[PDB]
Amino acid sequence: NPIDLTVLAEYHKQIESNLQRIERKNQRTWYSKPGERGITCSGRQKIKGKSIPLI
Amino acid sequence: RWLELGLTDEEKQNQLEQLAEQYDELKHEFEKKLEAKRRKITQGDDLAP
Amino acid sequence: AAFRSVFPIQSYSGNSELQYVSYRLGEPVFDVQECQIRGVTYSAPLRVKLRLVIYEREAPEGTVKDIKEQEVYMGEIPLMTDNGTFVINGTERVIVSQLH
Numbered sequence: 548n549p550i551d552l553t554v555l556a557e558y559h560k561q562i563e564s565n566l567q568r569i570e571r572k573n574q575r576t577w578y579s580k581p582g583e584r585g586i587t588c589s590g591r592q593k594i595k596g597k598s599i600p601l602i
Numbered sequence: 603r604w605l606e607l608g609l610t611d612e613e614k615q616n617q618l619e620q621l622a623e624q625y626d627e628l629k630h631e632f633e634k635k636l637e638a639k640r641r642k643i644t645q646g647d648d649l650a651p
Numbered sequence: 652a653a654f655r656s657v658f659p660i661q662s663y664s665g666n667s668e669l670q671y672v673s674y675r676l677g678e679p680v681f682d683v684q685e686c687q688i689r690g691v692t693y694s695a696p697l698r699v700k701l702r703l704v705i706y707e708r709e710a711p712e713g714t715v716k717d718i719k720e721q722e723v724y725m726g727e728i729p730l731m732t733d734n735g736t737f738v739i740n741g742t743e744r745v746i747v748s749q750l751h
Contacts, residue, residue, distance in 0.1 A: 581648035583724070584680065588649050589690035589740060 666706035672720065673700050679730060686738055693738035694727035 581587065605622055609615065658671040677696035686693050701723050704715040729737055736743050 578651050579648075580651075584648075584694075584727075585691065586650045587647050587689060587691055590650055 666708065666711065668704050668706070668715075670702050670704060671699075672702050674698065675700070675722075676728070683732060683738065687741055687743070690741040692727070692729050692740065693732070695730045696724065697726050697728055698722040699725055 605619070654671050654674065659668055660670075661668040675698040677698060679693065679695050681689075681691060681693065683693060699722065701721055703717075703719045703721075705717045707713045707716050729739075731737060732743070736745050738744075
């Protein structure tokens with residue numbers, strides 16, 4: 548009877564597999580490719596300036 | 603009920619009854635127009651990556 | 652004229668050849684005002700009926716054995732508004748004539 552952390556490896560593999568499934572689904576439906584027509588909108592984001600003192 | 607008001611069959615009223623079901627299928631065509639509009643409006647967009 | 656200047660196109664005597672039947676412009680998927688709202692061009696899709704042929708060997712004037720006809724999609728050509736302008740990225744742009 549030596550020491551044992553097989554349940555630790557199973558738990559860590561379960562965490563890795565569940566996180567890989569969720570992140571694969573999110574990176575599947577957020578960086579998809581639009582088809583035959585192109586990007587149907589535009590980003591249009593612009594940043595203006597401010598008056599920032601320097602004390 | 604004016605359309606289904608019974609009267610002796612002339613050829614003109616029967617052809618105009620056929621034209622009455624032709625506006626019925628035109629009404630079906632307006633229904634498909636409404637469906638064509640709502641599938642455009644309801645559906646989400648594509649965007650930039 | 653642009654399709655008669657290039658086609659037919661053929662290999663280095665391999666007797667495979669691509670020739671030209673006709674063309675067609677598809678309908679605009681988006682009309683003008685909401686296209687100006689959303690962001691795209693006022694495009695129109697293009698269809699080209701191409702007829703891929705391959706000959707039978709040892710007879711260059713021999714009858715082709717495989718013809719294959721398709722409506723290949725290529726590109727998007729922008730149409731013109733009723734006021735002479737074009738729509739590019741939500742906005743409205745004009746092409747100036749050139750004196751050369």
